[PDB]
């Protein structure tokens, strides 16, 4: 009982009632979001996508958090050429919990 859907350019396989982290979305932390772009739905019986994105499959998900990822330190260094550079990055992420998976 799991489904495959495309959210932020990268596909996720999520089972019922589990939390999945995906790219930042323009949704407030206390609102449900829709994912009608369901790549595949799996159950005891198997249903595939003759046309991409099934026919009526949707996924109900609730936003939980809108935090930032772990800091990543970017170092660029040229050997013997008197060039050093430092940078930091924290990627924005959105935690969402899957509430319901349709057929």
């Amino acid at each position: 009982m799991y489904a495959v859907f495309q959210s932020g350019g990268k596909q996720h396989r999520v089972s019922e009632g589990q939390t999945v982290r995906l790219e930042k979305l323009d949704i407030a932390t206390g609102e449900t979001v829709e994912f009608a772009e369901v790549l595949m739905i799996a159950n005891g019986e198997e249903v595939k996508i003759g046309v991409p994105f099934v026919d009526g499959g949707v996924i109900k998900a609730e936003v939980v958090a809108h935090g930032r990822g772990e800091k990543v330190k970017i170092v660029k260094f040229r050997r013997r050429k008197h060039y050093r550079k430092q940078q930091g990055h924290r990627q924005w992420f959105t935690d969402v919990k899957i509430t319901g998976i349709s057929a």
Binding site: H82, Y83, R84, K85
Partner: protein, 72 residues
């Protein structure tokens, strides 16, 4: 209010400091390049030097004279 006065924008530049790190830009000789006479401490050529060629103020002939009546 003595701790609220500020100068006009662009009045100060903070100057250039040489040889203080890589990220500061002009470090490691502070913008005077690699070896050479100009890179040395106190190096350089005097005014009018052309590297040995006859200077312009020597190739040309002196002309005229100064009139004392012009100053009065």
């Amino acid at each position: 209010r003595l701790n609220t006065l500020s100068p006009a924008e662009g009045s100060k530049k903070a100057g250039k400091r040489l040889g203080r790190g890589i990220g500061s830009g002009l470090g490691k000789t502070g913008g005077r390049g690699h070896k050479g006479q100009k890179s040395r401490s106190g190096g350089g050529v005097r005014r009018g030097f052309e590297g040995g060629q006859m200077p312009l103020y020597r190739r040309l002939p002196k002309f005229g004279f100064t009139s004392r009546k012009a100053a009065i």
